[PDB]
Design a protein around this ligand. Structure first.
Ligand code: OLB
Lengths: 30, 30
């Protein structure tokens, strides 16, 4: 039942969110 | 409220997961 969909997408929004945020903290660091 | 609880956990698990993944990936792969 679609209760896991909230988890997977939350992970997706969690993984994507961290990669980009760190990539914006490193983009200056060459 | 239970839906947002599942989504938030996905984010937290996603945030902690990605941080550890690349932190334990940068230092490893030299
Ligand atoms: C950077 C990667 C981050 C990975 C984080 C992974 C987080 C996983 C979080 C939660 C996993 C829960 C797994 C849930 C496992 C479902 C159990 C099951 O099979 O029962 C199904 C029933 O509905 C049948 O009636």
């Amino acid at each position: 039942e679609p209760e896991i969909t909230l988890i997977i997408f939350g992970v997706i929004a969690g993984v994507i969110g961290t990669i980009l945020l760190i990539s914006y903290g490193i983009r200056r660091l060459c």
